[PDB]
DNA sequence: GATCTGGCCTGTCTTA
DNA sequence: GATCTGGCCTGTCTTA
DNA sequence: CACAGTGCTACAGAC
DNA sequence: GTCTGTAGCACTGTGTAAGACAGGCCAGATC
DNA sequence: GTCTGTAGCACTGTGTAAGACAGGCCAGATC
DNA sequence: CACAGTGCTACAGAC
């Protein structure tokens, strides 16, 4: 079953903002993307998350000497590169949006470097140069890793962006549009990107969930901005790395799941659990969903949700990320006078 | 008889009358002696639309990059098309603004009487002289706390406000050629409210760098678009070409650090204008050159991001001199007179406190005796100098405290008769150099102090080094550093310091509160839209001339 | 072509124009269209001295005891001759006032027109009927915090203020006999600012019982002197005799307890009007008669001081029902509508908070759970009912919160459908009895709710007893007790409750702040002397008629 | 010599006001006269003062059952009735001014009743009725006890009062005048008072120090309100109790001391020490003075003052009372923003 | 069980 | 060394 | 059942 | 037919600090 | 000679929250 | 060297 326990943020509630990332590296979870530019208390901007005794504590992580430093991107595409040859195990980030609202259009590989001493870990970030046909600066898109024969590539798809520089006006400045619906194959070196268009992917989407397994990627419910619809349909994409041009085919599967901005926590070998973003523009999704996927296709079954508190049930918005091994963290904005100033109440939900 | 709608509109605006109060008076004066003297309300609503932005036709050559060519836009919401999806960053903001160049056109066209008379007094003629106008614009921006929130409908909004404004300082002409430029109009009271025109209002906290940049992005884009084009305006019957120089100087130190990518504010790197560290500014107190610029901060944060030499955090920090955030707004490398005054006054307050008790002998005092010394100092400054103790140092207290007689009222408490001479000498040294950064033009109205500044600051620094080393062994106030090391070259490069202060903007905050309480609809959806317009009217030269001219 | 000085003085006072702003407008309207429409400043200074206290000649019969017979005194300092020896209690106070009876005859001579009109329309004639006039005066007093202190000269003064005011409610006649009294004038808006005349201004804290009694002593002496005499005033050409009935009702409960010798305020003795203890007022919630009076409190503290039966502290306190201080000012035994509203609203707020969480099953929750419930309640009341959360409960929030739709917005959070209807029934019961204590005249406005009050309050009390016993086992708030036990006899003894509320005085505090900021000399020696006079002018019927009569 | 040590009031700051009394009973000192009416934290209004470890602590004292309760008088005349027959040892109070500024005109005998248990003391107050020829309600006056062969009586003299009820106006309400300069002999029972007029006492005075010994009373420097002068002359008055009318004679002595509102702490058998009130209306007296008095007369010698702190030297006003055995407590008003809210800084001065 | 080191904590400083 | 009791301390309530 | 506004937009009354 | 005056809309500000009291616990004094 | 307009006086309000950094200490991990 | 007031009292200028 599933249980939620309320947490308490001891001395850092000023760092979490609706768009942030939680990276599970070697069992340790790292918060990435904080409000504002990195202060001097933590000049890196990446924190180690430790949950214990109903408390949520954050620790300042440092980098290595050969690493490039990193702006706190807000809604980047995040791909867990799993431990394999050559060097395990990266965490691909591209590209999000900057504290001053630009879009990065840069790829960053984030790995673990050394330990300890006293449970101290140093990370490292290689900003990997991209030669293409590079994809445009965007956010809300998704990035996934695929293995075929037995080469490893990275598929990139979706996202929003600002209007083209020709139509952009100081009165159009903050309006966003979906990028054209092409898929990008990023080799990780050679740092060569290729763009491929698909007859069945007729319009772009954003804030979808992408689940990859062994040379097949399944795109679940996204949000289409042109028609203002949340499609129930599921996309299944089959790639294959032929020397030397990547032939690539697509298909629409009948019914998937109507969600946007979800939390996909992994529980099993290739099985995840969806904790829910939003069904409609006014109604956040309150039900859980188990999604295991195999060689035959996707499977999907209802799980019973936990006893949602009145507060987390009547809240307008919510967000969070997976703490790993069937556990995730959710946040709720708080309203009070005076300011608490703890901006968010925190819960930890766990499956089994 | 009957008054011109312009005259009575100026009457209504310049005397802080409400619309409801003005109507209350109009009907009354119209019922006794039935001949109506004041105009009704609707004709004033018709009278003002020539004074608000979005009325005159203009054009830029060449066209402005990514700025629309429409010239008739009025008040826009500053969200600028923020798509309101739920998965995106929220639209937490209520903000209103004028589109920058349109408001510029409006203020310039408002200055047309003075531009023409400035042309005629220099005995320059008019068929001539339509090609080389140069306008110098002082910009200003400041946050503002304690803004009570309405009940309204939505959305939930913070209780702080940010207020971006500007003012036209000078406007000159360069053609025929040899002349540097013949100034034709210049602001007589640049630190007044009546010459600080509002541009954009937001219910935003200063601190959230995410929403503030989202609001102020378009404005900075228009600024960067205007530096190349030339405006063309039919002023005095003829089409004339203008160019613009923007100098952002109305920022306190906190905002300058926030907007130039520097770390704030009690850092190891203290100066906004130089690269010297805190301890390094104890040894050498008076010898520092201005090196920092927006160009170079932009160039340096790329060093921070890419880290091309693969150094650790601290080696990188000192290689980059504390630039770890991307600078977002170009800021003139200068000083703020008002906040400098207040900072140096609070420093001298602490020095007096440390001289009542003799902390140069007993280096570690308790907390209760420091409080005791505070009490005795405040009681003495209440008996003489007629001051009450203040929760926080403000400008008027700073002005009355840094006088000769106040120091002499303090010396009556210091027992040792050589430290009395010491801080008395300190105070007159300080007074021999304050007018250089407080004057509107120092080279004209205090020239000898301007030339004697280097030597005076030298002696000030050495008095601190000798007779107060227990306090300034390795620590200095940032404003003390600026006051002692950078004043001459600033006044030589720009011409003045006090003329470009943040005084006028803070003065406009007063009007913000007044208007919010008495001159706007009481709703979240409309109050900013009203405060902006009425504030723009109150700061119009054309409406201000009706007050002065029909007296003298 | 020309305005009457009275007309334009009313124009300037009623529209909140400062003297400087009015002059700024007058010169302008006088230089355009040269013929001066408004009057200059000095003629208005001359116009108003007929309206301020100290202008008309009067006399009391018999003469007032220990009150001087001079009739031309104006603004006095309230210190009343405090000898300024250093060994004595300090003269910490800046205070100024009108001498009571003089201000009374001024406010009465103000109502000349309305007295004559009320005489003529009830068809009574005037050679007749000059013998038995009766004036009913509602007096009111309240403290006020957050009053910033000026630098000035001296002396050091607190940052709080006390403001004693009064208002003329009704004036009737009883000549010749059988008739109870034929009301000839009565206040149409008694809770408005325009009918709350200031008397006494002090920079004093409510709490210091030493200085407040020293300043308010003479005023209470004058009040006690006026209950005996007859005033004689030439109104309508004839000398006429007036009587005065004073009813002090504009006091919040804290002030009433301070002024009647009772202990404040969460005592074991809760009621100002009855003797029942806190626990005793839980078992029986609706059956209590009014017993306490000023004379009885006076004779009870004699018991406390002399202790004639030689009992311990607690036995004596029980004997005296908590009268351990000497009562200093007679106060009418009534209720305060505004503060009662705010108290009951905060109580219902707490009840909703304790229904979102189900604290009738889980009797002891944590503090973070209570904070979480507060968060969810405030968010719900922001979505529907469109309220922001408030630091403190104020009147407007109380008005919008105790509606039926707000309770239904809360029930959406209460899980199980029995407590839902429980508190819904509670709210509609409460709304069936609110208008009885907030109507200006309940017997005419809402007569059936007046009739049904006993039974309604009975059911309210029993609902509390039954399904909220977890909250009201032995604890009740004082205003709940007053609201449930004393309303009917109050409204049957006095006639109304809402007409005698603290609303007008609190409304005048707003004017105090306004005029201190913009209508007075900025000095400690003069600010009160100006606020008092301008406030007295702003609340004059004679100047307010020029606004309405010259429209319709 | 003499030493001053700064104290700290731990929690009692709102109770001490410029005019208050410190009564030394059986070694323990009691503060009497607090700001406002008695709260429920201490329904008596009398506190026990304990100074230790640089802290000043107040403890609520209770009364007996047969005692009358007592308004917090502000400037009453205070006479230490010493332990003798019949009942020791009382403390005479008459009459001060009430929280609402009336003058009491009542006489209260304050004695100790029982102890302990845990260093708990109960007092008692008998409002002694006065039959006369009673003195008028006043304050700032003085009261002393005298013994002559060997009957005991109390001399009462000086003080201010409100203007007569015939000339008192609501514009004269707070102005005070010195009451006529008669001396009142109060027998302590029966409570028969008698007034006597003296040819050499032409004008009334207030805020003077009265030192009594063995049927002679010495009135030191007072304040005359008619001429606004502080006389440096000393009055010495000699009483004698012959039934039935107490013959009574006076004399002016050459020079005394020009002070008002002083602190007379006892150090010896019949010798006190004066810590100083005010010399002139603008200049508080900063020097100490030893005053021993004998059968020949009064003697007077200057002692060295303690090293006055800058705060207690530049203060405008000050007050306090004798803690006994050559020790006294002084208080200084404090100025700050915000309010401390500790209204007074405290010092303890001690001789030898 | 002893030793080391990272990170937490407090107090002071600097600008608001 | 064990026991008792007064008074201090904290938290909740009631009005502002 | 506080109350006097806060400014703008519609919509009648008035020649 | 232009000019003029008011009704509708949704919300504003004045209402703003200590004291009472019950229960638990500890420290200091006595047997 | 009445009426009128301004100078003198002493003081007002707008300037209002977190972050940096050095030193001490403790807890948890390793030898 | 902020600056536009805050109201009252004197003291000139103007018919
Ligand atoms: Ca600021
Ligand atoms: Ca500000
Ligand atoms: Ca109050
Ligand atoms: Ca109040
Ligand atoms: Zn520098
Ligand atoms: Zn009752």
mmCIF file of C-alpha atoms in Angstrom, chain C residues 66-68 73 76 78-90 97 99 156 159 208-211 213-215 217-219 221-222 263 301 304-307 309-314 316-317 324-328, chain D residues 17-18 34-38 40 43 64-71 74-75 97-102 106 108 127 139 160 165 168-176 207 223 225 230 260-261 278 281-282 316-317 335 337:
data_model
loop_
_atom_site.group_PDB
_atom_site.id
_atom_site.type_symbol
_atom_site.label_atom_id
_atom_site.label_comp_id
_atom_site.label_asym_id
_atom_site.label_seq_id
_atom_site.Cartn_x
_atom_site.Cartn_y
_atom_site.Cartn_z
ATOM 1 C CA UNK C 66 -15.612 74.758 41.432
ATOM 2 C CA UNK C 67 -15.860 75.736 37.757
ATOM 3 C CA UNK C 68 -14.971 79.304 36.812
ATOM 4 C CA UNK C 73 -11.917 80.605 27.243
ATOM 5 C CA UNK C 76 -6.347 75.357 27.296
ATOM 6 C CA UNK C 78 -4.923 70.034 29.955
ATOM 7 C CA UNK C 79 -2.157 70.084 32.575
ATOM 8 C CA UNK C 80 -4.385 72.537 34.499
ATOM 9 C CA UNK C 81 -1.544 74.161 36.433
ATOM 10 C CA UNK C 82 0.801 71.235 37.109
ATOM 11 C CA UNK C 83 3.517 72.737 39.306
ATOM 12 C CA UNK C 84 6.783 71.900 37.601
ATOM 13 C CA UNK C 85 8.930 71.269 40.664
ATOM 14 C CA UNK C 86 11.632 68.642 40.214
ATOM 15 C CA UNK C 87 10.778 66.773 43.436
ATOM 16 C CA UNK C 88 7.156 66.303 42.303
ATOM 17 C CA UNK C 89 5.663 63.896 39.764
ATOM 18 C CA UNK C 90 6.926 64.961 36.311
ATOM 19 C CA UNK C 97 -8.643 70.614 25.524
ATOM 20 C CA UNK C 99 -13.266 73.479 28.818
ATOM 21 C CA UNK C 156 10.144 63.293 26.180
ATOM 22 C CA UNK C 159 4.099 57.266 21.356
ATOM 23 C CA UNK C 208 -0.729 54.533 33.185
ATOM 24 C CA UNK C 209 -3.563 55.156 35.640
ATOM 25 C CA UNK C 210 -1.533 57.929 37.305
ATOM 26 C CA UNK C 211 -1.292 60.461 34.464
ATOM 27 C CA UNK C 213 -6.585 60.474 35.989
ATOM 28 C CA UNK C 214 -4.537 63.657 36.429
ATOM 29 C CA UNK C 215 -5.476 64.832 32.937
ATOM 30 C CA UNK C 217 -9.840 64.855 36.615
ATOM 31 C CA UNK C 218 -11.083 68.348 35.746
ATOM 32 C CA UNK C 219 -13.285 66.967 32.950
ATOM 33 C CA UNK C 221 -15.374 67.346 37.840
ATOM 34 C CA UNK C 222 -17.159 69.484 35.236
ATOM 35 C CA UNK C 263 -9.814 43.692 37.267
ATOM 36 C CA UNK C 301 -14.190 49.333 47.333
ATOM 37 C CA UNK C 304 -12.214 46.229 50.246
ATOM 38 C CA UNK C 305 -10.112 48.970 51.853
ATOM 39 C CA UNK C 306 -11.557 48.917 55.370
ATOM 40 C CA UNK C 307 -12.076 45.116 55.459
ATOM 41 C CA UNK C 309 -15.167 41.645 58.734
ATOM 42 C CA UNK C 310 -11.452 40.696 58.835
ATOM 43 C CA UNK C 311 -11.291 37.988 56.173
ATOM 44 C CA UNK C 312 -8.448 36.777 53.975
ATOM 45 C CA UNK C 313 -7.599 38.078 50.508
ATOM 46 C CA UNK C 314 -9.692 35.545 48.587
ATOM 47 C CA UNK C 316 -12.650 39.403 50.732
ATOM 48 C CA UNK C 317 -12.386 39.395 46.931
ATOM 49 C CA UNK C 324 -10.063 46.198 44.506
ATOM 50 C CA UNK C 325 -9.509 49.634 42.927
ATOM 51 C CA UNK C 326 -11.482 52.821 43.456
ATOM 52 C CA UNK C 327 -13.841 53.564 40.537
ATOM 53 C CA UNK C 328 -13.004 56.932 39.019
ATOM 54 C CA UNK D 17 7.860 54.984 40.261
ATOM 55 C CA UNK D 18 9.720 58.184 41.297
ATOM 56 C CA UNK D 34 3.739 50.836 42.950
ATOM 57 C CA UNK D 35 2.614 52.186 39.604
ATOM 58 C CA UNK D 36 -1.117 51.673 39.176
ATOM 59 C CA UNK D 37 -3.606 49.882 41.369
ATOM 60 C CA UNK D 38 -2.623 46.463 42.783
ATOM 61 C CA UNK D 40 -3.853 40.206 40.906
ATOM 62 C CA UNK D 43 -3.199 41.981 45.512
ATOM 63 C CA UNK D 64 -3.098 38.909 57.769
ATOM 64 C CA UNK D 65 -6.856 38.480 58.181
ATOM 65 C CA UNK D 66 -7.566 41.390 60.556
ATOM 66 C CA UNK D 67 -5.667 43.914 58.412
ATOM 67 C CA UNK D 68 -7.147 46.685 56.291
ATOM 68 C CA UNK D 69 -5.897 46.856 52.736
ATOM 69 C CA UNK D 70 -3.976 49.804 51.478
ATOM 70 C CA UNK D 71 -3.888 52.094 48.423
ATOM 71 C CA UNK D 74 3.122 57.787 46.349
ATOM 72 C CA UNK D 75 4.827 60.384 48.606
ATOM 73 C CA UNK D 97 -1.502 60.465 47.145
ATOM 74 C CA UNK D 98 -3.695 57.792 45.527
ATOM 75 C CA UNK D 99 -3.398 56.264 42.014
ATOM 76 C CA UNK D 100 -6.255 58.572 40.994
ATOM 77 C CA UNK D 101 -4.715 61.718 42.317
ATOM 78 C CA UNK D 102 -6.493 62.217 45.624
ATOM 79 C CA UNK D 106 -5.444 58.564 56.702
ATOM 80 C CA UNK D 108 -1.782 53.395 58.675
ATOM 81 C CA UNK D 127 -5.901 52.198 59.811
ATOM 82 C CA UNK D 139 2.068 64.768 50.761
ATOM 83 C CA UNK D 160 2.039 70.237 49.880
ATOM 84 C CA UNK D 165 -11.953 73.950 47.868
ATOM 85 C CA UNK D 168 -9.946 75.357 43.298
ATOM 86 C CA UNK D 169 -10.978 75.611 39.639
ATOM 87 C CA UNK D 170 -10.985 73.023 36.865
ATOM 88 C CA UNK D 171 -8.186 75.233 35.503
ATOM 89 C CA UNK D 172 -6.481 75.255 38.935
ATOM 90 C CA UNK D 173 -6.992 71.520 39.401
ATOM 91 C CA UNK D 174 -3.389 70.275 39.479
ATOM 92 C CA UNK D 175 -1.716 73.292 41.112
ATOM 93 C CA UNK D 176 -0.454 72.689 44.650
ATOM 94 C CA UNK D 207 10.407 67.601 50.803
ATOM 95 C CA UNK D 223 11.664 73.674 49.571
ATOM 96 C CA UNK D 225 7.040 77.182 47.176
ATOM 97 C CA UNK D 230 15.695 76.243 49.018
ATOM 98 C CA UNK D 260 15.362 68.567 48.941
ATOM 99 C CA UNK D 261 14.112 64.982 48.561
ATOM 100 C CA UNK D 278 18.657 68.252 44.465
ATOM 101 C CA UNK D 281 15.888 73.110 40.243
ATOM 102 C CA UNK D 282 18.395 72.324 37.467
ATOM 103 C CA UNK D 316 18.330 64.968 34.922
ATOM 104 C CA UNK D 317 16.504 63.311 37.835
ATOM 105 C CA UNK D 335 15.762 56.698 27.173
ATOM 106 C CA UNK D 337 13.874 53.531 20.941
#
